Design a protein around this ligand. Structure first.
Ligand code: ZDC
Ligand code: CA
Ligand code: CA
Length: 114
C-alpha cells in the first residue's frame, strides 16, 4: 500500500520534524500538492533532529513524505492518529537496509498549530 501520503484540511499550517537513526545520511522530502515544500538532510544514530519546519497544506491538503539515502528510496511505514477528535499526528518510519528497525528516518507531522 501507498505510505507517507496524508490528506490534511486545506489551507492549514502543520509542523514537520525529522529524526535520524542510521549510519547513512537521510534525505527527507516533504511535498505539498505534489511539489517540494521542504527538504531535510542529516546523519545521526542517536535520534538527532535533522529538520523541523512549519508548512501550509494549501488548497489540496495533500502532503507526502519521501525518504531516501543517496537517491535510493527507503521502505516507508505510516499512519495517522487523531486524539480527542482534534489533535492530529501523521507518522512515518523508514527502513534503508535489512535490520527492519524502521527508524532510520522518523518523520512526525502534527496539526493544528497555534
Ligand atoms: C547500515 O549500517 C544500516 C543502518 O545503520 C545502522 C547503524 C542501523 O541504524 C540500521 O538500522 C540502519 O539501517
Ligand atoms: Ca534500519
Ligand atoms: Ca536504524
Amino acid at each position: 500500500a501507498t505510505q507517507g501520503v496524508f490528506t490534511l484540511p486545506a489551507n492549514t499550517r502543520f509542523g514537520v520534524t525529522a529524526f535520524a537513526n542510521s549510519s547513512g545520511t537521510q534525505t527527507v522530502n516533504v511535498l505539498v500538492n505534489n511539489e517540494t515544500a521542504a527538504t531535510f538532510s542529516g546523519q545521526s544514530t542517536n535520534n538527532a533532529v535533522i529538520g523541523t519546519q512549519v508548512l501550509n497544506s494549501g488548497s489540496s491538503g495533500k502532503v507526502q513524505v519521501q525518504v531516501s539515502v543517496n537517491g535510493r528510496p527507503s521502505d516507508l511505514v505510516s499512519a495517522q492518529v487523531i486524539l480527542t477528535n482534534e489533535l492530529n499526528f501523521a507518522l512515518v518510519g523508514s527502513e534503508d537496509g535489512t535490520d527492519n528497525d524502521y527508524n532510520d528516518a522518523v518523520v512526525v507531522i502534527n496539526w493544528p498549530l497555534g
